[PDB]
Amino acid sequence: MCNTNMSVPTDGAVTTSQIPASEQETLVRPKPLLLKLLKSVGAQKDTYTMKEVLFYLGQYIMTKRLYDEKQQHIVYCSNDLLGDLFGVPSFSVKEHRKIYTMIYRNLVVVNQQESSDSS
């Protein structure tokens, strides 16, 4: 993927997008799990976003030598920090939809304090 700058309306569908990590960002703030994930590669923040975690979690997978050896999409993670994410012996990063949707198991998004008007 290097000739992709505006996509192609020929045998390539409309858009190569899918998964909430840029279009649906969220100023993510998880518990020690995605930060032991990203802060490892190089990250270092009090919070993150699904966009940072997007390309960054992409980093840690491809890195730390946990990936397959066919097309770098069957990334085996036995006893790995990537494992703390879910816990698979292998996961398909190629399908970022299912891979990141199982990343966020329960729930975790931006907080943004609010007020009950009269309080």
**Residue type, position 110, single letter:** V
- The single-letter DSSP state of residue 11 is S
Structure determined by: NMR
User: Domain locations in the chain?
Assistant: 18-109
- Helix 96-103 with 52-62: angle, nearest 10 deg: 100
- The whole-angstrom separation of Cα 37 and Cα 27 is 17
**Which structure tokens are listed for 96?**
């970022």
> Between the CA of residue 78 and those of 7, 63, 83, what are the distances in Å?
36, 14, 7
> Between the CA of residue 60 and those of 50, 51, 65, what are the distances in Å?
15, 14, 9
Angle at 69 between CA 103 and CA 82, to 5 degrees: 25
- The whole-angstrom separation of Cα 4 and Cα 30 is 32
Q: Does domain 18-109 have CATH number 2.40.110.10?
A: no
- The whole-angstrom separation of Cα 107 and Cα 105 is 6
**Which structure tokens are listed for 66?**
């946990």
- In the chain, the DSSP E strands lie at 74-75, 91-92
- The whole-angstrom separation of Cα 57 and Cα 55 is 6
- The whole-angstrom separation of Cα 84 and Cα 89 is 11
- The single-letter DSSP state of residue 69 is S
- The whole-angstrom separation of Cα 62 and Cα 65 is 7
**Which structure tokens are listed for 26?**
């969220």
The C-alpha R_g of the chain, in whole angstroms, comes to 16
Angle at 109 between CA 103 and CA 115, to 5 degrees: 165
